[PDB]
Amino acid sequence: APVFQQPHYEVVLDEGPDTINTSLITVQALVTYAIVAGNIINTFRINKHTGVITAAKELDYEISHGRYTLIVTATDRLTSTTTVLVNVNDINDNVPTFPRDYEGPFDVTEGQPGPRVWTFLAHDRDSGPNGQVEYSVVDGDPLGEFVISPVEGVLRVRKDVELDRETIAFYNLTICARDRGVPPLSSTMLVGIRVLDIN
Ligand SMILES: [Ca+2]
Ligand SMILES: [Ca+2]
Ligand SMILES: [Ca+2]
């Protein structure tokens, strides 16, 4: 019955398109080699003779949550088993994404201080800082009457500010979502605000 040289095998790599068709690791027992489980969307290939595990597809932190766990067999017909942990580091490869490019119209009454508009949320598929999102208003607020809370994405008129329909009747605000990855990724959406008469 064949003896695996290591009790478990392990490697740590950055996810990304540079991983396609690279040799990750070679397992050895003392004889033919297979991956029998943990091979997510056929990411991996084993050389049946040489025992080298190659990435057929891009290593992806978002599919693996940072670790692929492969069950490998060695057979001559007696069989023995091990595990191959392919540990993956997260890179900033997902843009913070709003589900719609435009939402509107959101009604707001003139003549009242600090009314709420609505909450916007961009999703980021990355983890850690790479997945954390900061919100801002980057256009369409020429008098500085609005704020979006930078973590919670709540758009409101500033506390001690009242709108006035005759001054400005409609706003189209560009909202920016920026992640805390290096380099950072961002996207924008458009918010349509209609200002209502105090009747
Ligand atoms: Ca990825
Ligand atoms: Ca990532
Ligand atoms: Ca990101």
UniProtKB/Swiss-Prot annotation:
Record localization: Cell membrane
Role, per record: Cadherins are calcium-dependent cell adhesion proteins. They preferentially interact with themselves in a homophilic manner in connecting cells. CDH23 is required for establishing and/or maintaining the proper organization of the stereocilia bundle of hair cells in the cochlea and the vestibule during late embryonic/early postnatal development. It is part of the functional network formed by USH1C, USH1G, CDH23 and MYO7A that mediates mechanotransduction in cochlear hair cells. Required for normal hearing.
Record-given protein name: Cadherin-23
Tissue spec: In adult animals relatively high levels of expression are found in testis, skeletal muscle, heart, eye and thymus, and lower expression in kidney, lung and brain. Found in the sensory hair cells of the inner ear.
Oligomer status and interactors: Interacts with USH1C and USH1G. antiparallel heterodimer with PCDH15. Isoform C1: Interacts with CAMSAP3; leading to inhibit CAMSAP3 ability to induce microtubule bundle formation.
Sites carrying sugar chains: N21, N172
Entire protein: shown range: 1631 to 1845 of 3354
Domain of life: Eukaryota
Domain Cadherin, first and last residues per copy: 5-98, 99-199
Description of its domains: Three calcium ions are usually bound at the interface of each cadherin domain and rigidify the connections, imparting a strong curvature to the full-length ectodomain.
Record: disease: Defects in Cdh23 are the cause of waltzer (v) phenotype. Waltzer mice are characterized by deafness and vestibular dysfunction due to degeneration of the neuroepithelium within the inner ear.
